[PDB]
Amino acid sequence: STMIRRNVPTYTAYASELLYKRNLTSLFYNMLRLYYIKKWGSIKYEKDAI
Amino acid sequence: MSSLLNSLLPEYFKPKTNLNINSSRVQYGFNARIDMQYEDDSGTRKGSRPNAFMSNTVAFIGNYEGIIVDDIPILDGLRADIFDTHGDLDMGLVEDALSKSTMIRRNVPTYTAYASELLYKRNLTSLFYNMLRLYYIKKWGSIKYEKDAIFYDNGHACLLNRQLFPKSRDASLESSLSLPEAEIAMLDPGLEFPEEDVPAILWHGRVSSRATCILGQACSEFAPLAPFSIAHYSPQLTRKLFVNAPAGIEPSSGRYTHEDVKDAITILVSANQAYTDFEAAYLMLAQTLVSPVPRTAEASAWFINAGMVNMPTLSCANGYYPALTNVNPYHRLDTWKDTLNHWVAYPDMLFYHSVAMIESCYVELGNVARVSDSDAINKYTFTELSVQGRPVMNRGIIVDLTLVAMRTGREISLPYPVSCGLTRTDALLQGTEIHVPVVVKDIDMPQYYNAIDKDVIEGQETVIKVKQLPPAMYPIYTYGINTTEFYSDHFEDQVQVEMAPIDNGKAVFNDARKFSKFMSIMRMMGNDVTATDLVTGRKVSNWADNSSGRFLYTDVKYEGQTAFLVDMDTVKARDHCWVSIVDPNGTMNLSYKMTNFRAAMFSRNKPLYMTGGSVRTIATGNYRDAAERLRAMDETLRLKPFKITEKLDFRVAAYAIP
Amino acid sequence: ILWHGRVSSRATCILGQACSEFAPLAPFSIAHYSPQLTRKLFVNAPAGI
Amino acid sequence: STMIRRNVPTYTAYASELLYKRNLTSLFYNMLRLYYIKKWGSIKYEKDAI
């Protein structure tokens, strides 16, 4: 899947180290929290409540 | 691929060779005979339009921008000996082939080492693409673009060419581009080590004075003034280009005709054995030759931001290895020369193949935009499930060919999974509001269109908020081959609106489906109906187009609950050849029938006629049967005699055959 | 030694340090004392180093 | 082969000695040590430690 075949040995070496640590779960977690902060963003917390 | 784009054309359509285009706007369509009928408790009222013209306006303008991307190598052309059983370059047979050749003996060891990198640089698609554009620039060079011209107008809203295309000066297509020439150097056969990042091509005999000027301009930056479709922005392909021609390269002439570009292409494909490269370039240009004029005012959202064209980097290492190309090439499919042979015979047929492809795509993107994200085959994931290959990235031709496969309902097969050309699905995948500019004509505009202002004086520049993208084209060539209920492109159709005499003309359509068919058939009958939504309080008019003459449900410009009040004592007769609804009572039954079809084209409000010879379906067998024949009549001048015959007069002579 | 295509800018630095004396300060197991393997190393690469 | 013709006789004479010099174990050993030095480079050694 390339015409420039000089970079294949270098590309393979870096790919082998990175593929065994791929995880986007933490990014989606924060993106979901930002959705609900904006939607339900009129809830009041009073300190001297029960 | 000439074959698959040919099948898209209708059965009644019989095309000829020459098409004398003399403008930047064409109304392609057909003439049909519509037998309309209105049945009621009182009686039946019959009408008949003998020549009904259903058209789709297509222009030669459209903002595009080229970017140089990395794409797969096309291995068709190289000799079949060096390839192994599986079909990849077995290095070891390459070293064997170079050794037993007419190469300099001191270069064999150093050239063989480079082979591992350079032999996998085979993609001439970018060069053929630019050379095809130069052919059509010089042919249709007299077409004009005016700055303060009408891009769209429907009576209420108007959209000028100044609005969509700023930085735009008025000029002819010939006077648009001023291409500078790249250096065409001669390759020295006795060069020590090959220079990578500089492509070297093959040539038959001597490079002519005009061939230098064409190749020089093809490998250069396109910097246009007027926004033309065949003269869009492209980056510099290369700085220098080597040509392995033992006969010296003549210097640049300066001038050339469109016939000289055909001469340049036919020599380049034959020498390099690059037919699959040409097939890729033919399909690329088929997408980005003509762009559709939008059907409605709010269907201009597709052409606001410039769609990127993916041109694969120019890379060729045939000049350095002349031995590896010969008369016995490796090819996957047997019908691999069919696309070039079709273009050389009928160049002007590309116009018909282009409109067939964009009409197929923009129709399917119409009914793809109306599916919810929560589904299996949706907006984002319709390309992945359809594709059964291994392309680098799902872009360019893959997205356009998969939309054609959905329209026709057939299996499209290409020899190489190449991913180059225009990407259309840009505004769709974003999934945000688009702000199209508009200049107002009347003062009662913002009731109909979802405008930003509620009161606007005439001649003011306003903005319309488009959320869901309406269909840009109506199906005309693909009419009643794969019918859907959205477009309702049937030959026979009927609708039953149920009213009682207690109701004083006023009917409420609870159903959305039959409301669409009622409003559409009433427009065929030449009646101006104006419905009003009860929930929201907006208004819709069936007369929202001057081309097709149909009403799609996306003309409401709002998704909500369906409660359309239509008052049937405010119906106005607008067009000629029309049936009258004077005063209805009881149940109404509307119906029509389309019987025959005749191909028609319009340009500058005049008929555009097809001229020249009768175009045939060129097959691989039709030429190679004459190769099987060889003209085997032994080339021997056999002169047969004529015996003179005497009759009554004797003054005059008469010769007989035996 | 032999090589595929061009010897990269970083490959020169690695081969240069691999064929050299290890003179450590701290007694580490993967950085123990080793003599100079060779002074010069040829590389048959038609594409220049 | 693709060798220079004037070198064939002189190179063939040397073959008897040079072709039996094949041991790259020392080079691979040092290159493997450079891999782990740069990977686990942040480990520390204190002089007055237990």
Side-chain angles (χ1 to χ4, degrees):
Chain A
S1 68
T2 193
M3 281 162 57
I4 307 162
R5 296 223 171 185
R6 180 170 286 181
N7 304 329
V8 170
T10 310
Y11 275 26
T12 300
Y14 272 100
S16 66
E17 295 272 12
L18 282 176
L19 280 178
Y20 288 125
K21 44 165 74 72
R22 63 192 300 281
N23 223 55
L24 281 172
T25 71
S26 178
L27 185 62
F28 289 126
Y29 183 70
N30 288 27
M31 269 189 144
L32 255 62
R33 282 201 298 165
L34 281 178
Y35 178 87
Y36 287 112
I37 287 159
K38 283 286 135 65
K39 190 161 193 170
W40 308 329
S42 63
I43 310 170
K44 309 216 76 69
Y45 167 79
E46 312 97 323
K47 195 212 301 188
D48 307 353
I50 52 77
Chain B
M1 190 75 258
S2 62
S3 298
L4 81 88
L5 285 181
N6 208 323
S7 58
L8 263 56
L9 296 183
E11 205 75 358
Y12 59 82
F13 196 69
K14 294 300 197 302
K16 297 187 182 296
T17 69
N18 300 128
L19 180 64
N20 192 52
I21 293 167
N22 65 319
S23 181
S24 65
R25 194 154 293 182
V26 182
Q27 287 186 42
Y28 84 98
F30 59 81
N31 290 121
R33 175 185 167 79
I34 312 173
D35 289 317
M36 300 169 288
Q37 183 166 22
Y38 174 83
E39 181 158 37
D40 193 40
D41 287 340
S42 66
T44 71
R45 291 166 202 162
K46 297 168 66 177
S48 182
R49 291 210 295 172
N51 300 317
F53 187 55
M54 302 175 72
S55 75
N56 275 9
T57 318
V58 165
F60 272 96
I61 67 174
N63 57 326
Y64 303 122
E65 265 159 29
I67 47 160
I68 309 303
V69 302
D70 184 36
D71 200 287
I72 63 165
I74 312 184
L75 288 168
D76 281 9
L78 291 165
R79 65 191 292 176
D81 301 355
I82 63 169
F83 282 101
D84 73 330
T85 322
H86 308 103
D88 194 284
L89 294 180
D90 178 36
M91 311 215 94
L93 299 182
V94 167
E95 187 169 33
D96 191 282
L98 260 72
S99 182
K100 299 155 76 288
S101 79
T102 75
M103 201 171 204
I104 309 175
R105 199 56 48 201
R106 64 184 269 279
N107 282 27
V108 166
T110 181
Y111 271 60
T112 300
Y114 268 102
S116 305
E117 277 87 19
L118 283 180
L119 260 59
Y120 286 112
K121 291 201 187 184
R122 285 185 62 78
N123 208 323
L124 278 164
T125 308
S126 197
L127 186 51
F128 288 123
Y129 179 77
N130 283 32
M131 285 215 290
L132 253 68
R133 286 198 301 166
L134 283 177
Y135 176 89
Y136 288 112
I137 283 159
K138 288 230 146 285
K139 189 161 192 170
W140 306 326
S142 59
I143 71 172
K144 297 201 183 298
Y145 171 90
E146 297 91 333
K147 184 176 172 63
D148 301 319
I150 314 289
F151 183 72
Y152 187 80
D153 182 29
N154 68 282
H156 297 342
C158 173
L159 180 43
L160 297 175
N161 278 300
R162 189 178 64 259
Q163 298 294 330
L164 292 187
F165 312 113
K167 314 196 226 302
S168 179
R169 308 216 318 282
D170 60 322
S172 58
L173 178 51
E174 184 263 6
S175 185
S176 183
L177 292 170
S178 181
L179 296 168
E181 308 193 338
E183 182 180 353
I184 310 302
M186 190 197 315
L187 184 68
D188 192 5
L191 210 153
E192 196 197 325
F193 55 94
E195 308 186 1
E196 59 162 29
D197 281 305
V198 176
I201 68 186
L202 258 56
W203 205 269
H204 277 296
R206 188 169 187 76
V207 170
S208 58
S209 193
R210 284 143 183 279
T212 302
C213 187
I214 295 157
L215 287 177
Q217 285 182 26
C219 308
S220 177
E221 190 177 34
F222 284 64
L225 305 178
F228 280 106
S229 48
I230 77 166
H232 68 74
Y233 178 82
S234 180
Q236 187 174 24
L237 263 53
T238 181
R239 194 185 61 76
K240 204 176 77 182
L241 182 68
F242 281 123
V243 177
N244 185 233
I249 300 156
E250 288 176 35
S252 188
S253 181
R255 60 170 286 95
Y256 62 97
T257 60
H258 73 268
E259 295 99 322
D260 300 336
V261 174
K262 184 183 284 187
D263 177 37
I265 288 164
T266 313
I267 293 166
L268 190 64
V269 294
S270 188
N272 293 307
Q273 292 283 344
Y275 292 89
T276 313
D277 289 281
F278 186 85
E279 188 179 317
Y282 187 79
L283 282 171
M284 272 181 67
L285 187 58
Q287 296 170 125
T288 183
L289 191 77
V290 300
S291 89
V293 164
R295 198 184 83 80
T296 78
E298 59 152 18
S300 308
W302 297 89
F303 324 119
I304 295 295
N305 45 19
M308 294 289 176
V309 186
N310 295 284
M311 303 178 70
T313 187
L314 179 58
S315 60
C316 188
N318 292 320
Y320 301 120
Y321 306 87
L324 298 182
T325 313
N326 71 334
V327 305
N328 184 57
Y330 167 77
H331 57 257
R332 286 180 171 176
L333 305 183
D334 207 295
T335 72
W336 75 300
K337 292 188 177 181
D338 286 29
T339 313
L340 180 78
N341 289 16
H342 192 92
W343 182 79
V344 168
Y346 325 107
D348 295 316
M349 268 286 289
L350 180 56
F351 180 82
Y352 299 125
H353 287 151
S354 184
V355 295
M357 193 161 203
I358 67 162
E359 179 268 306
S360 293
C361 299
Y362 275 95
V363 155
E364 200 82 54
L365 289 188
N367 80 312
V368 150
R370 308 182 314 94
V371 304
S372 53
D373 301 46
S374 56
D375 209 313
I377 310 168
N378 69 318
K379 187 202 293 183
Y380 290 103
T381 80
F382 78 94
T383 74
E384 291 176 11
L385 282 101
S386 54
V387 168
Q388 195 177 194
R390 295 186 302 95
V392 165
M393 207 176 293
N394 56 337
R395 54 128 188 281
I397 199 61
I398 296 293
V399 54
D400 281 37
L401 277 183
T402 197
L403 285 169
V404 166
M406 288 166 63
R407 189 68 234 158
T408 57
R410 289 202 308 282
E411 307 92 328
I412 309 310
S413 178
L414 256 60
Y416 283 75
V418 68
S419 57
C420 58
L422 179 63
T423 183
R424 307 194 171 284
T425 62
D426 186 276
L428 184 63
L429 293 180
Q430 204 77 50
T432 75
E433 262 178 8
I434 310 96
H435 289 68
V436 309
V438 149
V439 55
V440 290
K441 289 317 195 177
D442 69 54
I443 323 100
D444 61 307
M445 190 269 282
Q447 289 98 62
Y448 292 88
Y449 293 114
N450 190 2
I452 207 81
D453 278 72
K454 281 59 62 187
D455 199 325
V456 280
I457 60 93
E458 62 87 34
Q460 185 184 150
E461 295 87 291
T462 195
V463 173
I464 308 174
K465 302 210 307 306
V466 177
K467 207 172 286 155
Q468 193 176 34
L469 299 173
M473 298 187 79
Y474 191 90
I476 282 179
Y477 278 174
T478 63
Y479 192 98
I481 61 168
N482 191 286
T483 181
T484 80
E485 285 280 313
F486 174 53
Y487 289 118
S488 71
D489 59 329
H490 303 107
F491 299 124
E492 310 181 354
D493 206 340
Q494 60 281 318
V495 56
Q496 178 160 31
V497 177
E498 212 166 2
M499 290 167 62
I502 193 63
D503 308 320
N504 50 315
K506 306 174 88 81
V508 174
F509 286 82
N510 65 80
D511 192 359
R513 181 169 161 284
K514 70 160 61 182
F515 171 72
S516 181
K517 277 200 289 183
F518 172 75
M519 289 278 280
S520 69
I521 292 170
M522 283 285 283
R523 203 229 171 283
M524 292 192 208
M525 289 178 180
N527 294 315
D528 183 39
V529 183
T530 170
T532 170
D533 298 36
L534 289 171
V535 178
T536 317
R538 71 169 63 265
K539 302 174 73 185
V540 308
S541 183
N542 61 334
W543 275 63
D545 189 29
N546 254 45
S547 62
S548 69
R550 302 301 197 84
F551 186 75
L552 305 180
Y553 183 63
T554 57
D555 297 29
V556 178
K557 312 172 197 293
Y558 174 72
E559 197 284 310
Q561 199 66 235
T562 62
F564 301 98
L565 181 65
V566 59
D567 198 4
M568 296 205 74
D569 72 342
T570 61
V571 168
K572 294 139 169 37
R574 200 162 179 183
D575 261 335
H576 201 269
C577 307
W578 57 284
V579 310
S580 63
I581 307 178
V582 276
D583 46 357
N585 56 324
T587 309
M588 309 189 302
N589 303 127
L590 298 91
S591 178
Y592 67 87
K593 290 185 183 176
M594 300 196 161
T595 170
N596 59 346
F597 297 89
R598 301 178 300 284
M601 295 179 71
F602 280 74
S603 179
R604 290 175 137 187
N605 309 130
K606 285 165 60 199
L608 192 78
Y609 294 115
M610 303 188 293
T611 70
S614 61
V615 169
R616 50 152 182 172
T617 74
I618 66 101
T620 323
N622 280 230
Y623 177 43
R624 67 107 194 89
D625 60 34
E628 274 157 27
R629 176 58 221 183
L630 175 138
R631 194 173 93 75
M633 294 315 307
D634 55 327
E635 301 96 319
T636 60
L637 189 71
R638 282 191 284 92
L639 300 162
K640 265 155 172 81
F642 297 126
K643 180 168 66 266
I644 190 158
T645 67
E646 283 150 307
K647 59 95 201 179
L648 60 138
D649 198 345
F650 142 89
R651 183 164 166 77
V652 295
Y655 278 107
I657 290 84
Chain C
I1 68 186
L2 258 56
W3 205 269
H4 277 296
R6 188 169 187 76
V7 170
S8 58
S9 193
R10 284 143 183 279
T12 302
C13 187
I14 295 157
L15 287 177
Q17 285 182 26
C19 308
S20 177
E21 190 177 34
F22 284 64
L25 305 178
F28 280 106
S29 48
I30 77 166
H32 68 74
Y33 178 82
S34 180
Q36 187 174 24
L37 263 53
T38 181
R39 194 185 61 76
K40 204 176 77 182
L41 182 68
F42 281 123
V43 177
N44 185 233
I49 300 156
Chain D
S1 79
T2 75
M3 201 171 204
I4 309 175
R5 199 56 48 201
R6 64 184 269 279
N7 282 27
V8 166
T10 181
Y11 271 60
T12 300
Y14 268 102
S16 305
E17 277 87 19
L18 283 180
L19 260 59
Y20 286 112
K21 291 201 187 184
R22 285 185 62 78
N23 208 323
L24 278 164
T25 308
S26 197
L27 186 51
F28 288 123
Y29 179 77
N30 283 32
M31 285 215 290
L32 253 68
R33 286 198 301 166
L34 283 177
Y35 176 89
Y36 288 112
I37 283 159
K38 288 230 146 285
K39 189 161 192 170
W40 306 326
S42 59
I43 71 172
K44 297 201 183 298
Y45 171 90
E46 297 91 333
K47 184 176 172 63
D48 301 319
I50 314 289

